[PDB]
Design a protein around this ligand. Structure first.
Ligand code: 4HD
Length: 256
């Protein structure tokens, strides 16, 4: 049967995901819901902030923090992409294009794994910065993360685990609707059996979660929105802070 072929694919992607991302959702949840060995230091104010620097501008200093981290995620995501069957065999220009557009959608999908209603894990889970402390930041920085939490709280309500996420982030990267794609066909063919792999995976892994597959695909809309707001807000910074530098890798990704 072909089902056997789809599980092998599901398994392969899961193995690669674990190899590419150091902080999985399983670990993240273990830390958030916990355990005495995985307990994080919590940052909820400026004092605990300067206290946190030990154990582990202001709004700008953390903004650069996210920047460096996002660059790391891009690297990890790029490494995972190469493992998707057929990906590296596609035209180079498109490989670059698929990455340029899928990286941020994937970053916010996985960032949810490190979030709960109250805040978000940092420094590979050694810390936990409160949602409120982030919202208290001088504008426009103060409202950089709120849209992520709102998305996270509802995305997390689907109760997906890592083996599920591995296939879904792969489906995201292999999107034949990306601006500027040279050969949409071979890309669509790959996503086709990836979606087939996802459908079966959700059915077996969540036998009683009616239409999770359809529900999860609709979430691909919420991600689009998030990216846009982030980009607009980003344009504001570059003008209000002509003295703050932005990483090249991230600048080339935003030409959009
Ligand atoms: C030690 C890091 C301190 C705080 C981290 C808190 C949140 C960051 C968590 C994940 C990073 C993902 C997105 C960061 C949010 C906005 C990023 C602003 C830019 O700069 C870089 C983001 C980008 O454009 O990719």
């Amino acid at each position: 049967p072909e089902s056997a072929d789809l599980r092998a694919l599901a398994k392969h992607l899961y193995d690669s995901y674990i190899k590419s991302f150091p902080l999985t959702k399983a670990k993240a949840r273990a830390i958030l819901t916990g355990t005495t060995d995985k307990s994080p230091f919590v940052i909820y104010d400026m004092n605990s902030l300067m206290m946190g620097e030990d154990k582990i501008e202001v709004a700008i200093r953390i903004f650069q923090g996210c920047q460096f981290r996002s660059v790391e995620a891009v690297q990890e995501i790029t490494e995972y992409a190469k493992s998707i069957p057929g990906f590296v065999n596609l035209d180079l220009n498109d490989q670059v294009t698929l990455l340029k557009y899928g990286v941020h959608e994937i970053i916010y999908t996985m960032l949810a794994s490190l979030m709960n209603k109250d805040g978000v894990l940092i420094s590979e889970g050694q810390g936990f910065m409160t949602r409120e402390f982030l919202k208290s930041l001088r504008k426009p920085f103060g409202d950089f993360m709120e849209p992520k939490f709102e998305f996270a709280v509802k995305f997390n309500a689907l109760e997906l685990d890592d083996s599920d996420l591995a296939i879904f982030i792969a489906v995201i990267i292999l999107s034949g609707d990306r601006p500027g794609l040279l050969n949409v066909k071979p890309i669509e063919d790959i996503q086709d059996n990836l979606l087939q792999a996802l459908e079966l995976q959700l059915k077996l892994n969540h036998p009683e979660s009616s239409q999770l597959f359809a529900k999860l695909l609709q979430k691909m809309t919420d991600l689009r929105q998030i990216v846009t707001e982030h980009v607009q807000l980003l344009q504001v910074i570059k003008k209000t802070e002509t003295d703050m530098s932005l990483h090249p890798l991230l600048q080339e990704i935003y030409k959009d």
